[PDB]
Amino acid sequence: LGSIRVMLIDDHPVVRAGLRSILDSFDDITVVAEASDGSNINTKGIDVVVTDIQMPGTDGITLTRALANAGGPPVLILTTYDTEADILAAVEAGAMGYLLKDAPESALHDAVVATFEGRRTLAPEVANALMQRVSKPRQALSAREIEILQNLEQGLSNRQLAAKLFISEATVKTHLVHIYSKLGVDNRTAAITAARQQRLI
Ligand SMILES: [Mg+2]
Ligand SMILES: [Mg+2]
Ligand SMILES: [Mg+2]
Ligand SMILES: [Mg+2]
Ligand SMILES: [Mg+2]
Ligand SMILES: [Mg+2]
Ligand SMILES: [Mg+2]
Numbered sequence: 001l002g003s004i005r006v007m008l009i010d011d012h013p014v015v016r017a018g019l020r021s022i023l024d025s026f027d028d029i030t031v032v033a034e035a036s037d038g039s040n041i042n043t044k045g046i047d048v049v050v051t052d053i054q055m056p057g058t059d060g061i062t063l064t065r066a067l068a069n070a071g072g073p074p075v076l077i078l079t080t081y082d083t084e085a086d087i088l089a090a091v092e093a094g095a096m097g098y099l100l101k102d103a104p105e106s107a108l109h110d111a112v113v114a115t116f117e118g119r120r121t122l123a124p125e126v127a128n129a130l131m132q133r134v135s136k137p138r139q140a141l142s143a144r145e146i147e148i149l150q151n152l153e154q155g156l157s158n159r160q161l162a163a164k165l166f167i168s169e170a171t172v173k174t175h176l177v178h179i180y181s182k183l184g185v186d187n188r189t190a191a192i193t194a195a196r197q198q199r200l201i
Contacts, residue, residue, distance in 0.1 A: 022108060028113070043070075048076060060077055099121060107123070152192055153201060
């Protein structure tokens with residue numbers, strides 16, 4: 001056949017229509033099927049699946065894995081640089097290709113062809129979006145949190161901490177949750193050890 005037969009999947013018909021128009025505009029690509037999620041999909045006659053991440057029912061991450069399990073057609077995942085979707089889970093799913101939805105049209109064409117030919121598209125723009133999303137610098141422990149650790153080191157219970165610092169036992173407990181998360185621990189003895197190793201107190 002002269003054209004690569006695409007199934008285009010997106011829960012947002014206003015966005016889907018723009019992508020369809022772009023894909024169909026190439027002489028070597030034809031959108032033969034559309035869907036609004038990844039459920040019940042029949043891939044007979046489909047050369048490439050082009051899919052969104054965020055969709056109700058079966059999302060693009062689950063669809064990617066399902067098609068992989070079936071030995072189904074290869075998948076190109078489209079997203080946005082500022083997506084609220086789980087971009088890390090999408091990348092971990094191991095689709096053949098990844099591209100942003102507002103990439104140059106030629107790049108979308110080339111991504112479809114690459115996907116069809118079984119060549120990976122790990123688009124730098126997607127990689128950059130992933131790094132931005134997952135690499136979040138975390139704030140220092142606050143003065144209050146350091147104070148709590150210094151008193152935990154002296155062996156104070158939650159009640160004693162509350163009495164000494166003039167904050168409620170519930171407020172103490174909330175702080176401890178946050179401290180334990182920052183320290184990578186789940187109890188008070190381990191927190192003290194970590195705070196000592198980390199030279200925090
Ligand atoms: Mg969408
Ligand atoms: Mg056009
Ligand atoms: Mg066409
Ligand atoms: Mg095929
Ligand atoms: Mg453009
Ligand atoms: Mg070209
Ligand atoms: Mg000290």
